[PDB]
Design a protein around this ligand. Structure first.
Ligand SMILES: C=CCN(C)CCCCCCOc1ccc2c(-c3ccc(Br)cc3)nn(C)c2c1
Ligand SMILES: C=CCN(C)CCCCCCOc1ccc2c(-c3ccc(Br)cc3)nn(C)c2c1
Ligand SMILES: CCCCCCCCOCCOCCOCCOCCO
Ligand SMILES: CCCCCCCCOCCOCCOCCOCCO
Lengths: 619, 619
């Protein structure tokens, strides 16, 4: 019955695989990427009219009827996003008259204008001279002098925030302005009567930092700042040492863009670091069939590859399938063998992790590492020496990453400080990298493949962790995936792999929760609003990935041969396309709960296959 | 009469000009470049058998009958060079038997073997495990902690030595060893009875440094070295910040090669700086028609271009010649506009100099700057705004570079410390960059084109400088050109340009000196031995360049219409080739008096043209 669905899905994945043997689907986000890029170009004075065009199409193409832009397809209009997209268009050419501009300008005003945008947005606008720098939360270069065990040293921040700060300090240190031609000045972003509803720090703001900031803007005005030069150079050097191989920084849009600006600021446009960082951009860009052009927030080659492999293996293909070997080999060449920022906390830990993207050695992550190591563990490669060796190196690296609570973060160990979450500057996304349920689940699911059960202390410390985090309704939060369906699926699936009894009370309380949210159409769906409004937990239009997720929780919990179970399987089998693929007009990936969402292109194809492959095991 | 010679010579230079509008002749040195490269490859574990071949032919091709290699064509066999070339060949394949090997081996032994080679040679051999590191002069990473005004801080060294030291500290800090396959081990470099005649420090060795070194090799043995990590990183950063645009480091073979090794040491082979630095090498390499391959010590695009222009202008071509405009424009794009290491002494001086090579922003030199600015001053470019502006920036930069004695160094101001010249490590070439007569001459010759005469204090301070340096016989030393013929020509030519009276006593005493060394063939020649043995001052086989030099001194001194004068002109006119060029099987360029010599490929063509062009002015 469902078989045909598999054979079609399988042959589809293999058709998407690149020559080198890996998979790599685009990563969708929102239009701030492309908008900030446009500004970056203006800043660096490298504007290509042809690109500006492809970029204008995209922006318009992503604009909804109301004339706004959201963070995810079918999401509430976002102010920040829309503001940035607005300025971008006006620069490219658009006149404040054009209906599209009109609608957006009104939405923006009805919200309180620029005065209500996130720090970043205001900062960018500050960079082009459309906003006072004084009203921008200050982050000083001197921050570079904080020791390893002090309040607010750069290592109290999550990896992604860290580099961003380092880069910015240099920028905010000079507070440079790159004038926009009159033709695009946007004073109209001020023209508003509505009260400027401002967003505060993430976990609240203590009058302390609030004062401190005021102090910094004051000190920033003096004629002489002792050791500032040294602070800056410290920052610059920190950047030059960590520049990724593809010329980026962390393989992420934010710090990368800032670093470049910072270098421009220091007249190092003719320095290797800058040149490479500049040309490396093209790799993250993407041509759109409808003429548009988009820039990726990041790239998921490794990630996509790892999953694709597990899906195909769980599906049916032989452990030694020649096509799955290209992958295996490719993955082995990817393993990072040098100390990254993580070494700051684990100086005696041997390198052995993997990164999300192609070449990012200083920031391998636990999630990627776990999936890769586990994927390889299911293959029979030619060189059993390197396969045996690599798995062991990664395995021990993961074990040495486990945080205090027995959980697993993404990039660092016990990066659970709270200080950063109160700074005036941090009003967007996460700023720290504490352990999460989903990353942890994947890790256990990995060890489980080797056989390590609940007997091993490391496993116990982790299980206890999850057990304490489980939500009242028996659900599990989804940190890097939308959302409870994502997390719960991961957890139940993992706990089943480490030997735990699938009959347990808290376990059953989780499976019930799943069946209870199965949409009429037989599938499962969870909208990104579930991060803002609890009423959306497990509620949303059914999607291929999210369905496969809830499906895995059921198959793992033993309820494989259930109604709701067979029901879902029907959904996937039907909704499948003629080519063997699947569609998913919704985001199921999470960047920052409630602030930044992602659209993983391979999910719609990989997970459904993995889900089916396991349902085929259950029979 | 001579006219035809010019027309031929002129059309020749115009034929060698590249499309972009610049000239660029290869720079010849000795085989240590190619030999160290081979080792570099072995170190970095990137050996291309096809390249090794091209390199073998070269090495053999440059070996003389006796089975040795010298520093210049027709020069005494050099031990260091030969030793390195020897090891190189043995690695490539050669067996210690092969006649070429046998002859070299014996020469090496008759000299005391490896124990008599310069520090560098022994160090390289140390790197591959064929020599004890303990016997290698120690240069610690900690040197990075010396303040700007302290004994032996990195800024007391000449630019070229500085970077070399910084790179090495990191290396000597780890004292790594990269084993050679048994097949190429060279213990036979020890098999000798002759006493190990060792070379000491440049300006002598005080028992202090001698003991200090011993101290270091001892401290180097301890189990813990406090702040060493910080010392290394200081070095690494210093290197990362200064890496040239073409991925080199100063546009010179030494530091470039070491930096790469140092990076390899720190497992940064997957870092942009390393990658770019690695691929940058190919640009300095050269394919030889006879199948060989050579690596340039540096590249002289700018330099060649500047001179070629002056030669052609002095010859006859219009100041607005479309072909000379390509050059002018190209040169304008070359001007450096950012602070280089020189800024450490002149923080208030505005950037405006030029570099020897294509892209080396942190090390513009006075010589290049003077020639370029002066060359432009003789052109009529389309954008008189940038030509007027540029010349001004360069002019002021040069002025702000004049050292204390009124003289001009090459890269720094008053870089005349003496401490460095006594270190155990510095036993090869120069280690400081004090003002020289030749660089100074070119500078005056430059201002002179604008009109600034002896009235201006700057000029006076410089003239007095030269006047005090002039040798007893009325000759002038040649720092960057072989030798007294080179210097004297430059000086007399310059002094004539700044208004000084060509009838003066010391002046006439210089011209007489020239005429007194004119070879029978009617030309002038000065062998590189004139740096070692005074009996060779103005003695040696006549060459096209050196002749044109002595010729310029005569034309400038007023004795243009002389016997010796017209005599030389005859030489050039005759020795000229059918194509309009000239040959020169001898080196007329100086890298380090008595230690390193260069072969400037364009000299044979440019100077003869310039000399004639001026003799045509004298009529
Ligand atoms: C499960 C997969 C592996 N996982 C491990 C990697 C997936 C995350 C990478 C994509 C997210 O990229 C980012 C990463 C960081 C940011 C920031 C940001 C926010 C606050 C500060 Br302070 C600095 C930057 N803004 N935006 C859009 C960002 C986008
Ligand atoms: C007149 C032209 C402009 N002039 C201004 C530049 C010409 C000089 C550049 C070629 C010489 O390049 C070098 C420059 C430096 C070195 C060293 C060296 C010597 C001692 C130490 Br300590 C470190 C390096 N070894 N070798 C072969 C070297 C070769
Ligand atoms: C990173 C601080 C930027 C300010 C430095 C520019 C001012 C000049 O400093 C004096 C000496 O430094 C000159 C060296 O050039 C080396 C490259 O290092 C990069 C930034 O200058
Ligand atoms: C300069 C020390 C070289 C010794 C290698 C050990 C590396 C330890 O680095 C400290 C940990 O921080 C890791 C950060 O990423 C930066 C890498 O810089 C590269 C060379 O150290």
């Amino acid at each position: 019955a469902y078989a045909r669905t598999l054979d079609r899905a399988v042959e589809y994945l293999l058709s998407c695989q690149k020559d080198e043997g890996y998979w790599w689907g685009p990563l969708l986000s929102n239009v701030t990427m492309e908008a900030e890029y446009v500004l970056l170009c203006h800043i660096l004075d490298r504007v290509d009219r042809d690109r500006m065009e492809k970029i204008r199409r995209y922006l318009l193409h992503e604009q909804r009827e109301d004339g706004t832009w959201a963070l995810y397809p079918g999401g509430p209009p976002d102010l920040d996003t829309t503001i940035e997209a607005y300025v971008a268009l006006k620069y490219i050419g658009m006149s404040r008259d054009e209906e599209p501009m009109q609608k957006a300008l009104r939405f923006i005003q009805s919200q309180g204008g620029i005065e209500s945008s996130r720090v970043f947005t205001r900062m960018w606008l500050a960079l082009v001279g459309e906003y006072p720098w004084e009203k921008v939360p200050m982050v000083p270069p001197e921050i570079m002098f904080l020791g390893k065990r002090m309040p607010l040293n750069i290592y109290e921040f999550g990896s992604w925030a860290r580099a961003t700060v380092v880069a910015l300090s240099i920028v905010m240190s000079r507070q440079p302005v790159f004038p926009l031609p009159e033709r695009a000045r946007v004073p109209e972003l001020y023209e508003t009567d509505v009260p400027p509803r401002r967003r505060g720090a993430k976990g609240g703001g203590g009058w302390i930092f609030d004062a401190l900031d005021r102090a910094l803007h004051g000190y920033q005005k003096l004629s002489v700042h002792p050791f500032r030069r040294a602070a800056e150079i410290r920052a610059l050097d920190w950047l030059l040492e960590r520049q990724a191989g593809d010329g980026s920084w962390g393989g992420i849009q934010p710090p990368w863009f800032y670093a470049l600006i910072a270098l421009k600021i220091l007249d190092m446009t003719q320095h290797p670091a800058f040149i490479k960082g500049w040309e490396g951009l093209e790799l993250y860009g993407v041509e759109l069939d409808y003429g548009g052009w988009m820039f990726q927030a990041s790239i998921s080659p490794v990630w996509d590859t790892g999953l694709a492999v597990l899906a195909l293996r769980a599906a049916g293909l032989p452990a030694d399938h020649d096509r799955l070997v290209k992958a295996g080999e490719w993955l082995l060449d990817r393993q990072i063998t040098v100390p990254g920022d993580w070494a700051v906390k684990r100086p005696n830990l041997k390198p052995g992790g993997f990164a999300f993207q192609f070449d990012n050695v200083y920031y391998p992550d636990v999630d990627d590492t776990a999936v890769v190591v586990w994927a390889l563990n299911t293959l029979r490669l030619p060189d059993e020496r390197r396969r045996r060796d690599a798995m062991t190196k990664g395995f021990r690296w993961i074990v040495g990453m486990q945080s205090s609570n027995g959980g697993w973060g993404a990039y660092d160990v016990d990066n659970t400080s709270d200080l950063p979450n109160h700074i005036p500057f941090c009003d967007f996304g996460e700023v720290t990298d504490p352990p999460s349920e989903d990353v942890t689940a994947h890790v256990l699911e990995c060890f489980g493949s080797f056989g390590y059960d609940d007997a091993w202390k490391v496993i116990r410390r982790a299980v206890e962790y999850l057990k304490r985090e489980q939500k009242p309704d028996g659900s599990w939060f989804g940190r890097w995936g939308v959302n409870y369906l994502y997390g719960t699926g991961a957890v139940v699936s993992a706990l089943k792999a480490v030997g735990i009894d699938t009959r347990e009370p808290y376990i059953q309380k989780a499976l019930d929760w799943v069946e209870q949210h199965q949409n009429p159409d037989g599938g499962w769906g969870e909208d990104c609003r579930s991060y803002e409004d609890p009423a959306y937990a497990g509620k949303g239009a059914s999607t291929p990935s999210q369905t496969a997720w809830a499906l895995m929780a059921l198959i793992a919990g033993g309820r494989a041969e259930s109604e709701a179970a067979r029901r879902g399987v029907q959904y996937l089998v039907e909704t499948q396309r003629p080519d063997g693929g699947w569609d998913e007009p919704y985001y199921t990936g999470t960047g920052f709960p409630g602030d930044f969402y992602l659209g993983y292109t391979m999910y719609r194809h990989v997970f459904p296959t993995l889900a089916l492959g396991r349902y085929k095991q259950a029979i």
